[PDB]
Amino acid sequence: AKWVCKICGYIYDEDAGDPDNGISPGTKFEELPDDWVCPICGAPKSEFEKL
Numbered sequence: 001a002k003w004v005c006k007i008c009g010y011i012y013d014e015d016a017g018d019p020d021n022g023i024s025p026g027t028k029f030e031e032l033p034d035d036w037v038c039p040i041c042g043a044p045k046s047e048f049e050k051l
């Protein structure tokens with residue numbers, strides 16, 4: 001699944017993860033650490049919406 005940051009338009013793609021920020025590919029959005037934030041704009045997880 002892909003989730004969009006409602007603040008800046010960054011798409012968290014679970015297939016891609018966010019390796020530069022310690023998230024390996026295939027990591028589900030719900031599995032992201034609670035302290036994970038949008039790597040672009042810094043938005044907390046609350047600000048993402050599943051597509």
Ligand SMILES: [Fe+3]
Nearest residue numbers: 005008038041
């Ligand atoms: Fe963002």
